[PDB]
A paper describes a structure:
The crystal structures of the ZNRF3ecto–Rspo2Fu1–[name] and RNF43ecto–Rspo2Fu1–[name] complexes revealed a 1:1 interaction between [name] of the Rspo2Fu1–[name] and a single ZNRF3ecto or RNF43ecto chain. Neither the Rspo2Fu1–[name] nor the ZNRF3ecto dimer show major conformational changes on complex formation. The Met-finger at the tip of the second β-hairpin of [name] nestles into a pocket formed between the β3 strand and the αC–β7 loop of the ZNRF3ecto, which is lined with hydrophobic residues (I95, I191, V192, A198). The αC–β7 loop is a flexible region in the unliganded ZNRF3ecto crystal structures and moulds to interface the RspoFu1–[name] M68 in the complex. Overall, the ZNRF3ecto dimer structure appears less flexible in the complex structures compared with the unliganded structures. The acidic region of the β3–β4 loop (immediately adjacent to C104 of the disulphide bridge) becomes more ordered in the ligand-bound ZNRF3ecto structures, probably as a result of electrostatic interactions with a positively charged patch on Rspo [name]. For all ZNRF3ecto–Rspo2Fu1–[name] complex structures we determined (from five different combinations of species and crystal forms), the dimer found in most of the unliganded ZNRF3ecto crystal structures reoccurs. The overall assembly thus comprises a 2:2 complex of ZNRF3ecto–Rspo2Fu1–[name]. The 2:2 complex resembles a crab with the ZNRF3ecto dimer forming the body from which the two Rspo2Fu1–[name] ligands diverge, without interacting with each other, as the pincers.
[name]/[name] specifically targets these Wnt receptors for ubiquitination and turnover, hence reducing Wnt signalling responses. Direct extracellular interaction with Rspo proteins inhibits [name]/[name] activity.
Residue numbers in the entry:
A (entry chain A), B (entry chain A): 22 to 182
C (entry chain B), D (entry chain B): 39 to 141
Write the structure that this text describes.
Amino acid sequence: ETGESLAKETAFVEVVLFESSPNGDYKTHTTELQGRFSRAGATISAEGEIVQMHPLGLCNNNDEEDLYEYGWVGVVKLEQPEMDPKPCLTVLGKAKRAVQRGATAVIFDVSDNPDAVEQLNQGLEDPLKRPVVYMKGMDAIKLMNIVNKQKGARARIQHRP
Amino acid sequence: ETGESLAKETAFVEVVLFESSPNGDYKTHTTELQGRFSRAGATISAEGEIVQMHPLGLCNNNDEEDLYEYGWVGVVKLEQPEMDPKPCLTVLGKAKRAVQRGATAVIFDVSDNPDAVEQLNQGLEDPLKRPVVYMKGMDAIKLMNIVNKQKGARARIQHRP
Amino acid sequence: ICKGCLSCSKDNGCLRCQPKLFFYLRREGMRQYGECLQSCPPGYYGVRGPDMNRCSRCRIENCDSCFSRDFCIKCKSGFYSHKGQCFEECPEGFAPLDDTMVC
Amino acid sequence: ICKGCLSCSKDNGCLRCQPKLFFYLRREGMRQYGECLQSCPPGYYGVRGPDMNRCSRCRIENCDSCFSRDFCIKCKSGFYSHKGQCFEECPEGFAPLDDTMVC
Protein backbone atom coordinates (compact mmCIF):
# COMPACT_ATOMS: atom_id res chain seq x y z
CA GLU A 1 0.00 0.00 0.00
CA THR A 2 1.59 3.27 -1.11
CA GLY A 3 1.87 6.38 1.06
CA GLU A 4 2.05 10.14 0.66
CA SER A 5 3.92 10.74 -2.56
CA LEU A 6 7.32 12.29 -2.65
CA ALA A 7 6.72 15.99 -3.43
CA LYS A 8 7.53 17.00 -6.97
CA GLU A 9 10.70 18.79 -7.76
CA THR A 10 10.67 22.47 -8.54
CA ALA A 11 11.32 23.64 -12.08
CA PHE A 12 13.08 26.99 -11.95
CA VAL A 13 11.97 28.71 -15.11
CA GLU A 14 14.25 31.56 -15.88
CA VAL A 15 12.84 33.88 -18.49
CA VAL A 16 15.20 36.00 -20.44
CA LEU A 17 14.15 39.10 -22.37
CA PHE A 18 16.64 40.70 -24.70
CA GLU A 19 17.33 43.99 -26.60
CA SER A 20 19.48 44.29 -29.69
CA SER A 21 21.88 47.24 -30.02
CA PRO A 22 22.39 48.34 -33.65
CA ASN A 23 26.05 47.17 -33.70
CA GLY A 24 25.28 43.56 -32.85
CA ASP A 25 25.26 43.05 -29.05
CA TYR A 26 22.45 42.15 -26.64
CA LYS A 27 21.58 43.34 -23.19
CA THR A 28 19.34 40.99 -21.27
CA HIS A 29 17.33 41.07 -18.08
CA THR A 30 16.20 37.90 -16.42
CA THR A 31 13.04 36.84 -14.50
CA GLU A 32 12.94 33.81 -12.19
CA LEU A 33 9.62 31.88 -12.09
CA GLN A 34 8.78 28.55 -10.54
CA GLY A 35 6.73 25.48 -11.39
CA ARG A 36 7.01 21.70 -10.99
CA PHE A 37 8.31 18.86 -13.12
CA SER A 38 5.70 16.16 -13.45
CA ARG A 39 5.86 12.39 -13.84
CA ALA A 40 4.53 12.92 -17.38
CA GLY A 41 7.89 14.10 -18.57
CA ALA A 42 11.54 14.09 -17.76
CA THR A 43 13.21 15.94 -14.91
CA ILE A 44 16.02 17.63 -16.81
CA SER A 45 17.07 21.15 -17.74
CA ALA A 46 15.91 22.52 -21.09
CA GLU A 47 16.06 25.78 -22.99
CA GLY A 48 14.48 27.42 -26.02
CA GLU A 49 12.43 30.22 -27.50
CA ILE A 50 8.93 30.46 -26.10
CA VAL A 51 5.89 29.83 -28.31
CA GLN A 52 2.32 29.93 -27.11
CA MET A 53 0.07 27.16 -28.39
CA HIS A 54 -3.66 27.33 -28.30
CA PRO A 55 -4.89 24.09 -26.64
CA LEU A 56 -6.86 23.30 -29.84
CA GLY A 57 -3.72 23.84 -31.92
CA LEU A 58 -2.65 20.47 -30.66
CA CYS A 59 -4.82 17.82 -32.22
CA ASN A 60 -4.24 14.74 -34.43
CA ASN A 61 -6.18 16.06 -37.40
CA ASN A 62 -3.46 14.73 -39.67
CA ASP A 63 -3.96 18.20 -41.27
CA GLU A 64 -0.60 19.68 -42.38
CA GLU A 65 0.43 22.36 -39.80
CA ASP A 66 3.24 24.96 -39.83
CA LEU A 67 6.85 23.90 -39.44
CA TYR A 68 8.17 25.65 -36.34
CA GLU A 69 11.94 25.69 -35.94
CA TYR A 70 13.11 22.80 -33.80
CA GLY A 71 13.81 23.44 -30.15
CA TRP A 72 10.94 25.70 -29.13
CA VAL A 73 9.46 25.75 -25.63
CA GLY A 74 5.71 25.43 -25.69
CA VAL A 75 3.48 27.44 -23.39
CA VAL A 76 -0.13 26.34 -23.18
CA LYS A 77 -2.90 27.80 -21.03
CA LEU A 78 -5.67 25.32 -20.31
CA GLU A 79 -9.27 26.21 -20.20
CA GLN A 80 -11.86 25.28 -17.66
CA PRO A 81 -12.91 21.75 -18.45
CA GLU A 82 -16.64 22.49 -18.84
CA MET A 83 -15.85 24.77 -21.74
CA ASP A 84 -14.32 21.73 -23.41
CA PRO A 85 -16.65 18.76 -22.88
CA LYS A 86 -14.83 16.32 -25.24
CA PRO A 87 -11.06 16.85 -25.83
CA CYS A 88 -9.36 15.81 -29.11
CA LEU A 89 -6.49 14.76 -26.87
CA THR A 90 -5.78 14.24 -23.23
CA VAL A 91 -3.45 16.74 -21.72
CA LEU A 92 -0.87 13.92 -22.00
CA GLY A 93 -1.45 13.73 -25.73
CA LYS A 94 -1.14 17.50 -26.18
CA ALA A 95 2.28 17.36 -24.59
CA LYS A 96 3.23 14.47 -26.86
CA ARG A 97 2.09 16.33 -29.95
CA ALA A 98 3.99 19.52 -29.12
CA VAL A 99 7.17 17.44 -28.95
CA GLN A 100 6.44 15.78 -32.24
CA ARG A 101 6.29 19.26 -33.68
CA GLY A 102 9.72 20.21 -32.27
CA ALA A 103 9.06 21.35 -28.73
CA THR A 104 12.11 20.77 -26.53
CA ALA A 105 9.91 21.25 -23.45
CA VAL A 106 6.37 22.18 -22.52
CA ILE A 107 4.76 24.31 -19.82
CA PHE A 108 1.16 24.28 -18.73
CA ASP A 109 -0.69 27.01 -16.85
CA VAL A 110 -3.10 24.84 -14.94
CA SER A 111 -4.29 27.51 -12.63
CA ASP A 112 -7.76 27.28 -14.21
CA ASN A 113 -7.85 23.48 -14.23
CA PRO A 114 -6.33 21.77 -11.29
CA ASP A 115 -7.31 18.24 -12.37
CA ALA A 116 -4.65 18.46 -15.04
CA VAL A 117 -1.94 18.20 -12.45
CA GLU A 118 -3.13 14.78 -11.29
CA GLN A 119 -3.91 13.85 -14.86
CA LEU A 120 -0.15 14.50 -15.47
CA ASN A 121 1.05 12.75 -12.35
CA GLN A 122 -0.89 9.64 -13.35
CA GLY A 123 1.99 8.42 -15.55
CA LEU A 124 0.14 5.38 -16.93
CA GLU A 125 0.51 6.50 -20.56
CA ASP A 126 4.15 6.59 -21.68
CA PRO A 127 6.25 9.44 -20.13
CA LEU A 128 8.10 11.75 -22.48
CA LYS A 129 11.79 12.27 -23.21
CA ARG A 130 11.45 16.03 -22.71
CA PRO A 131 10.29 17.93 -19.57
CA VAL A 132 6.67 18.79 -18.89
CA VAL A 133 6.18 21.55 -16.42
CA TYR A 134 3.13 22.90 -14.66
CA MET A 135 2.72 26.38 -13.24
CA LYS A 136 0.09 28.50 -11.57
CA GLY A 137 -0.72 31.55 -9.55
CA MET A 138 1.40 34.66 -9.75
CA ASP A 139 4.13 32.78 -11.63
CA ALA A 140 1.78 31.57 -14.34
CA ILE A 141 0.30 34.99 -14.57
CA LYS A 142 3.71 36.61 -14.83
CA LEU A 143 4.53 34.26 -17.69
CA MET A 144 1.35 34.95 -19.68
CA ASN A 145 1.98 38.67 -19.60
CA ILE A 146 5.36 38.32 -21.09
CA VAL A 147 3.98 36.15 -23.85
CA ASN A 148 1.37 38.79 -24.35
CA LYS A 149 3.41 41.98 -24.49
CA GLN A 150 7.03 41.18 -25.28
CA LYS A 151 8.09 40.52 -28.85
CA GLY A 152 10.49 37.67 -27.98
CA ALA A 153 11.69 35.82 -24.92
CA ARG A 154 13.72 32.72 -24.11
CA ALA A 155 12.93 30.20 -21.46
CA ARG A 156 15.49 28.28 -19.42
CA ILE A 157 13.99 25.51 -17.34
CA GLN A 158 16.54 24.56 -14.72
CA HIS A 159 16.87 21.65 -12.33
CA ARG A 160 18.81 21.68 -9.00
CA PRO A 161 19.41 18.87 -6.43
CA GLU B 1 49.83 26.08 -0.30
CA THR B 2 47.29 24.59 -2.70
CA GLY B 3 47.28 20.98 -3.86
CA GLU B 4 46.18 18.93 -6.86
CA SER B 5 43.07 20.64 -8.17
CA LEU B 6 39.70 19.05 -8.00
CA ALA B 7 39.15 17.49 -11.47
CA LYS B 8 36.78 19.41 -13.69
CA GLU B 9 33.26 18.26 -14.16
CA THR B 10 32.21 16.59 -17.36
CA ALA B 11 29.95 18.44 -19.77
CA PHE B 12 27.75 15.92 -21.54
CA VAL B 13 27.09 17.50 -24.89
CA GLU B 14 24.16 15.87 -26.53
CA VAL B 15 23.87 16.72 -30.18
CA VAL B 16 20.53 16.42 -31.81
CA LEU B 17 20.04 16.21 -35.57
CA PHE B 18 16.54 16.49 -36.94
CA GLU B 19 14.47 15.78 -40.13
CA SER B 20 11.24 17.50 -41.04
CA SER B 21 8.36 15.45 -42.47
CA PRO B 22 6.20 17.43 -44.93
CA ASN B 23 3.17 17.43 -42.56
CA GLY B 24 4.94 19.16 -39.71
CA ASP B 25 6.61 16.58 -37.41
CA TYR B 26 10.28 15.88 -36.66
CA LYS B 27 12.21 12.70 -36.19
CA THR B 28 15.48 13.14 -34.34
CA HIS B 29 18.55 11.07 -33.62
CA THR B 30 20.89 11.99 -30.83
CA THR B 31 24.70 11.83 -30.34
CA GLU B 32 26.36 11.95 -26.91
CA LEU B 33 29.75 13.74 -26.75
CA GLN B 34 31.82 14.78 -23.78
CA GLY B 35 33.93 17.74 -22.70
CA ARG B 36 34.63 19.70 -19.50
CA PHE B 37 33.19 22.79 -17.88
CA SER B 38 35.94 25.24 -17.05
CA ARG B 39 36.41 27.82 -14.31
CA ALA B 40 36.04 30.47 -17.04
CA GLY B 41 32.32 29.95 -17.17
CA ALA B 42 29.40 28.59 -15.26
CA THR B 43 28.71 24.93 -14.55
CA ILE B 44 25.08 24.76 -15.66
CA SER B 45 23.04 23.09 -18.38
CA ALA B 46 22.42 25.04 -21.58
CA GLU B 47 20.84 24.47 -24.96
CA GLY B 48 20.67 26.09 -28.38
CA GLU B 49 21.31 25.92 -32.09
CA ILE B 50 24.95 25.44 -33.00
CA VAL B 51 26.87 28.13 -34.87
CA GLN B 52 30.52 27.89 -35.80
CA MET B 53 32.57 31.04 -35.25
CA HIS B 54 35.89 31.64 -36.86
CA PRO B 55 38.33 32.61 -34.05
CA LEU B 56 38.94 35.94 -35.86
CA GLY B 57 35.19 36.55 -36.03
CA LEU B 58 35.44 37.44 -32.40
CA CYS B 59 37.29 40.70 -32.05
CA ASN B 60 36.50 44.15 -30.58
CA ASN B 61 36.74 46.01 -33.87
CA ASN B 62 33.68 47.99 -32.89
CA ASP B 63 32.75 47.18 -36.54
CA GLU B 64 29.00 46.43 -36.85
CA GLU B 65 28.59 42.60 -37.19
CA ASP B 66 25.54 40.45 -38.03
CA LEU B 67 22.71 40.05 -35.56
CA TYR B 68 22.44 36.35 -34.79
CA GLU B 69 19.24 35.23 -33.08
CA TYR B 70 19.67 35.13 -29.33
CA GLY B 71 20.40 31.82 -27.70
CA TRP B 72 22.91 30.24 -30.07
CA VAL B 73 25.64 27.86 -28.95
CA GLY B 74 29.02 28.87 -30.27
CA VAL B 75 31.52 26.35 -31.55
CA VAL B 76 35.04 27.61 -32.08
CA LYS B 77 38.09 25.65 -33.24
CA LEU B 78 41.36 27.20 -32.12
CA GLU B 79 44.42 27.31 -34.21
CA GLN B 80 47.95 26.48 -33.29
CA PRO B 81 49.29 29.47 -31.41
CA GLU B 82 52.29 30.08 -33.70
CA MET B 83 49.94 30.72 -36.57
CA ASP B 84 48.52 33.55 -34.47
CA PRO B 85 51.43 35.45 -32.89
CA LYS B 86 49.35 38.37 -31.48
CA PRO B 87 45.65 37.71 -30.64
CA CYS B 88 43.02 40.50 -30.81
CA LEU B 89 41.59 38.84 -27.71
CA THR B 90 42.55 36.24 -25.19
CA VAL B 91 40.58 33.08 -25.38
CA LEU B 92 38.75 34.48 -22.33
CA GLY B 93 37.79 37.57 -24.30
CA LYS B 94 36.55 35.53 -27.27
CA ALA B 95 34.18 33.69 -24.96
CA LYS B 96 33.01 37.01 -23.52
CA ARG B 97 32.38 38.45 -26.95
CA ALA B 98 30.37 35.47 -28.19
CA VAL B 99 28.04 35.96 -25.23
CA GLN B 100 27.69 39.64 -25.92
CA ARG B 101 26.52 38.63 -29.35
CA GLY B 102 23.85 36.26 -27.97
CA ALA B 103 25.64 33.00 -27.32
CA THR B 104 23.95 31.05 -24.52
CA ALA B 105 27.06 28.87 -24.24
CA VAL B 106 30.39 28.31 -25.93
CA ILE B 107 32.49 25.29 -26.84
CA PHE B 108 36.14 25.21 -27.75
CA ASP B 109 37.98 22.49 -29.63
CA VAL B 110 41.36 22.87 -28.00
CA SER B 111 42.81 19.71 -29.36
CA ASP B 112 45.30 21.77 -31.40
CA ASN B 113 46.15 24.15 -28.55
CA PRO B 114 46.36 22.64 -25.14
CA ASP B 115 47.51 25.83 -23.40
CA ALA B 116 44.02 27.18 -23.82
CA VAL B 117 42.71 24.80 -21.22
CA GLU B 118 44.96 26.26 -18.51
CA GLN B 119 44.38 29.72 -19.92
CA LEU B 120 40.66 29.00 -19.19
CA ASN B 121 41.22 27.45 -15.79
CA GLN B 122 43.18 30.52 -14.72
CA GLY B 123 39.98 32.36 -13.72
CA LEU B 124 41.69 35.65 -12.86
CA GLU B 125 39.64 37.65 -15.39
CA ASP B 126 35.94 37.70 -14.53
CA PRO B 127 34.11 34.34 -15.06
CA LEU B 128 31.03 34.33 -17.25
CA LYS B 129 27.34 33.80 -16.51
CA ARG B 130 27.07 31.19 -19.26
CA PRO B 131 28.99 27.87 -19.61
CA VAL B 132 32.31 27.57 -21.39
CA VAL B 133 33.18 24.10 -22.46
CA TYR B 134 36.33 22.55 -23.84
CA MET B 135 36.56 19.43 -25.95
CA LYS B 136 39.14 17.40 -27.80
CA GLY B 137 40.05 14.15 -29.44
CA MET B 138 37.45 11.95 -31.04
CA ASP B 139 34.64 13.98 -29.44
CA ALA B 140 35.87 17.27 -30.84
CA ILE B 141 36.38 15.65 -34.17
CA LYS B 142 32.91 14.15 -34.15
CA LEU B 143 31.50 17.61 -33.46
CA MET B 144 33.38 19.35 -36.28
CA ASN B 145 32.08 16.88 -38.82
CA ILE B 146 28.54 17.53 -37.92
CA VAL B 147 29.08 21.26 -38.21
CA ASN B 148 30.66 20.55 -41.55
CA LYS B 149 28.13 18.28 -43.22
CA GLN B 150 24.75 18.62 -41.52
CA LYS B 151 22.49 21.53 -42.39
CA GLY B 152 21.29 22.12 -38.80
CA ALA B 153 21.86 20.68 -35.36
CA ARG B 154 21.02 21.54 -31.76
CA ALA B 155 23.33 21.23 -28.83
CA ARG B 156 22.28 20.32 -25.30
CA ILE B 157 25.04 20.75 -22.75
CA GLN B 158 24.04 18.81 -19.67
CA HIS B 159 25.32 18.70 -16.11
CA ARG B 160 24.95 15.75 -13.68
CA PRO B 161 26.05 15.39 -9.99
CA ILE C 1 -11.42 41.65 -30.77
CA CYS C 2 -13.09 38.33 -29.83
CA LYS C 3 -15.78 38.23 -32.61
CA GLY C 4 -17.60 34.98 -33.60
CA CYS C 5 -16.46 33.14 -30.44
CA LEU C 6 -18.77 30.69 -28.70
CA SER C 7 -16.35 31.06 -25.74
CA CYS C 8 -13.46 33.49 -25.55
CA SER C 9 -10.57 33.84 -23.07
CA LYS C 10 -8.18 36.70 -22.60
CA ASP C 11 -5.19 34.53 -23.16
CA ASN C 12 -6.23 32.18 -26.00
CA GLY C 13 -8.78 34.30 -27.94
CA CYS C 14 -11.66 32.26 -29.31
CA LEU C 15 -11.79 28.65 -28.18
CA ARG C 16 -14.81 27.28 -29.94
CA CYS C 17 -16.71 29.01 -32.79
CA GLN C 18 -20.39 29.66 -33.54
CA PRO C 19 -21.93 27.02 -35.71
CA LYS C 20 -21.44 28.27 -39.29
CA LEU C 21 -18.00 29.99 -38.99
CA PHE C 22 -14.30 29.00 -39.35
CA PHE C 23 -11.62 28.63 -36.66
CA TYR C 24 -8.30 30.34 -37.45
CA LEU C 25 -5.17 30.36 -35.37
CA ARG C 26 -3.54 33.72 -35.75
CA ARG C 27 0.13 33.59 -34.88
CA GLU C 28 1.47 36.96 -33.86
CA GLY C 29 4.94 36.70 -32.34
CA MET C 30 5.01 34.32 -29.39
CA ARG C 31 1.21 34.53 -29.28
CA GLN C 32 -1.34 32.33 -30.98
CA TYR C 33 -5.05 32.82 -30.53
CA GLY C 34 -8.46 31.92 -31.89
CA GLU C 35 -10.44 33.87 -34.44
CA CYS C 36 -13.82 32.76 -35.73
CA LEU C 37 -14.26 33.78 -39.34
CA GLN C 38 -16.98 34.04 -41.92
CA SER C 39 -14.66 32.77 -44.63
CA CYS C 40 -10.92 31.92 -44.48
CA PRO C 41 -8.30 34.61 -45.02
CA PRO C 42 -6.31 35.01 -48.19
CA GLY C 43 -3.62 32.29 -48.30
CA TYR C 44 -5.92 29.78 -46.57
CA TYR C 45 -8.64 27.31 -47.30
CA GLY C 46 -11.31 25.84 -45.05
CA VAL C 47 -12.19 22.29 -44.08
CA ARG C 48 -15.63 21.51 -42.64
CA GLY C 49 -14.72 18.70 -40.28
CA PRO C 50 -17.46 16.70 -38.52
CA ASP C 51 -16.50 18.23 -35.17
CA MET C 52 -15.45 21.76 -36.27
CA ASN C 53 -14.63 23.93 -39.27
CA ARG C 54 -11.15 25.46 -39.56
CA CYS C 55 -8.63 27.15 -41.79
CA SER C 56 -5.46 25.68 -43.20
CA ARG C 57 -2.63 27.38 -45.06
CA CYS C 58 -2.21 26.72 -48.77
CA ARG C 59 1.34 25.33 -49.44
CA ILE C 60 0.96 24.83 -53.20
CA GLU C 61 3.76 26.71 -54.98
CA ASN C 62 2.21 29.38 -57.25
CA CYS C 63 -1.37 28.90 -56.18
CA ASP C 64 -3.70 31.82 -55.55
CA SER C 65 -6.80 30.01 -54.22
CA CYS C 66 -6.45 26.65 -52.54
CA PHE C 67 -9.60 24.60 -52.32
CA SER C 68 -8.13 21.63 -50.44
CA ARG C 69 -4.53 20.92 -49.26
CA ASP C 70 -3.60 19.32 -52.60
CA PHE C 71 -5.86 21.19 -55.07
CA CYS C 72 -5.53 24.67 -56.53
CA ILE C 73 -8.44 26.29 -58.48
CA LYS C 74 -6.78 29.54 -59.63
CA CYS C 75 -3.02 29.39 -60.41
CA LYS C 76 -0.83 32.52 -60.71
CA SER C 77 -0.77 34.76 -63.83
CA GLY C 78 1.77 33.02 -66.09
CA PHE C 79 1.30 29.40 -64.94
CA TYR C 80 0.03 25.97 -66.15
CA SER C 81 -2.62 23.94 -64.31
CA HIS C 82 -1.74 20.25 -63.93
CA LYS C 83 -3.36 17.56 -61.67
CA GLY C 84 -4.19 20.40 -59.25
CA GLN C 85 -0.70 21.94 -59.19
CA CYS C 86 0.84 25.00 -60.83
CA PHE C 87 3.80 24.94 -63.23
CA GLU C 88 5.98 27.63 -64.89
CA GLU C 89 6.65 25.01 -67.52
CA CYS C 90 4.52 21.85 -67.82
CA PRO C 91 6.39 18.76 -66.51
CA GLU C 92 7.60 16.00 -68.78
CA GLY C 93 4.95 13.55 -69.99
CA PHE C 94 2.47 16.12 -71.26
CA ALA C 95 2.25 19.54 -72.83
CA PRO C 96 0.02 22.63 -73.11
CA LEU C 97 -3.45 22.54 -74.71
CA ASP C 98 -4.22 25.04 -77.53
CA ASP C 99 -6.52 27.93 -76.44
CA THR C 100 -6.58 26.82 -72.68
CA MET C 101 -3.44 26.97 -70.36
CA VAL C 102 -4.10 23.46 -68.92
CA CYS C 103 -2.06 20.32 -69.93
CA ILE D 1 38.82 26.33 -52.17
CA CYS D 2 41.38 28.00 -49.85
CA LYS D 3 42.66 30.74 -52.26
CA GLY D 4 44.54 33.86 -51.03
CA CYS D 5 45.20 32.35 -47.57
CA LEU D 6 48.47 33.01 -45.77
CA SER D 7 47.45 30.02 -43.59
CA CYS D 8 44.46 27.79 -44.16
CA SER D 9 42.83 25.08 -42.00
CA LYS D 10 40.30 22.47 -42.97
CA ASP D 11 37.86 23.61 -40.38
CA ASN D 12 38.11 27.44 -40.44
CA GLY D 13 39.15 28.14 -44.07
CA CYS D 14 41.58 31.03 -44.37
CA LEU D 15 42.90 32.41 -41.11
CA ARG D 16 45.15 35.22 -42.19
CA CYS D 17 45.31 36.73 -45.71
CA GLN D 18 48.15 37.65 -48.09
CA PRO D 19 49.18 41.25 -47.79
CA LYS D 20 47.03 43.11 -50.35
CA LEU D 21 43.74 41.12 -50.10
CA PHE D 22 40.50 41.23 -48.02
CA PHE D 23 39.29 38.85 -45.29
CA TYR D 24 35.66 37.72 -45.64
CA LEU D 25 33.73 35.48 -43.33
CA ARG D 26 31.42 33.36 -45.42
CA ARG D 27 28.55 32.03 -43.38
CA GLU D 28 27.07 28.90 -44.89
CA GLY D 29 24.65 27.19 -42.51
CA MET D 30 26.29 26.38 -39.19
CA ARG D 31 29.67 26.96 -40.85
CA GLN D 32 31.70 30.13 -41.06
CA TYR D 33 35.08 30.25 -42.73
CA GLY D 34 37.74 32.55 -44.11
CA GLU D 35 38.06 33.71 -47.69
CA CYS D 36 40.77 36.06 -48.87
CA LEU D 37 39.48 38.28 -51.65
CA GLN D 38 40.79 40.65 -54.24
CA SER D 39 37.89 43.02 -53.69
CA CYS D 40 34.80 42.64 -51.45
CA PRO D 41 31.69 40.87 -52.70
CA PRO D 42 28.54 42.62 -53.79
CA GLY D 43 26.67 43.82 -50.67
CA TYR D 44 29.94 44.52 -48.83
CA TYR D 45 32.58 47.16 -48.42
CA GLY D 46 36.17 46.90 -47.26
CA VAL D 47 38.08 48.52 -44.42
CA ARG D 48 41.89 48.61 -44.51
CA GLY D 49 42.62 48.35 -40.81
CA PRO D 50 46.19 48.80 -39.52
CA ASP D 51 46.39 45.11 -38.61
CA MET D 52 44.27 43.56 -41.43
CA ASN D 53 41.87 44.35 -44.25
CA ARG D 54 38.35 42.91 -44.15
CA CYS D 55 34.84 43.06 -45.53
CA SER D 56 31.75 44.37 -43.82
CA ARG D 57 28.13 44.16 -44.90
CA CYS D 58 26.38 47.31 -46.09
CA ARG D 59 23.24 47.94 -43.92
CA ILE D 60 22.14 51.19 -45.58
CA GLU D 61 18.54 50.81 -46.77
CA ASN D 62 18.44 51.22 -50.57
CA CYS D 63 22.15 51.44 -51.14
CA ASP D 64 23.88 49.65 -53.99
CA SER D 65 27.55 50.39 -53.21
CA CYS D 66 28.63 51.10 -49.66
CA PHE D 67 31.94 52.84 -49.27
CA SER D 68 32.01 52.92 -45.47
CA ARG D 69 29.44 51.72 -42.86
CA ASP D 70 27.58 55.06 -42.95
CA PHE D 71 28.20 56.26 -46.53
CA CYS D 72 26.59 55.17 -49.79
CA ILE D 73 28.05 56.26 -53.18
CA LYS D 74 25.43 54.80 -55.56
CA CYS D 75 21.80 54.71 -54.31
CA LYS D 76 19.08 52.56 -55.95
CA SER D 77 17.29 53.55 -59.20
CA GLY D 78 14.47 55.82 -57.98
CA PHE D 79 16.11 57.25 -54.84
CA TYR D 80 17.45 60.55 -53.35
CA SER D 81 20.98 60.94 -51.95
CA HIS D 82 21.12 62.73 -48.59
CA LYS D 83 24.03 63.00 -46.07
CA GLY D 84 25.17 59.58 -47.35
CA GLN D 85 21.77 57.87 -47.08
CA CYS D 86 19.10 56.92 -49.60
CA PHE D 87 15.50 58.18 -49.55
CA GLU D 88 12.34 57.34 -51.55
CA GLU D 89 11.21 60.81 -50.60
CA CYS D 90 13.63 63.42 -49.22
CA PRO D 91 13.14 63.93 -45.44
CA GLU D 92 11.70 67.11 -43.99
CA GLY D 93 14.08 70.07 -43.81
CA PHE D 94 15.23 69.98 -47.42
CA ALA D 95 14.08 69.12 -50.90
CA PRO D 96 15.32 67.90 -54.31
CA LEU D 97 17.77 69.89 -56.46
CA ASP D 98 16.78 70.67 -60.10
CA ASP D 99 18.67 68.54 -62.68
CA THR D 100 20.49 66.37 -59.98
CA MET D 101 18.61 63.86 -57.64
CA VAL D 102 20.51 65.05 -54.51
CA CYS D 103 18.94 67.32 -51.79
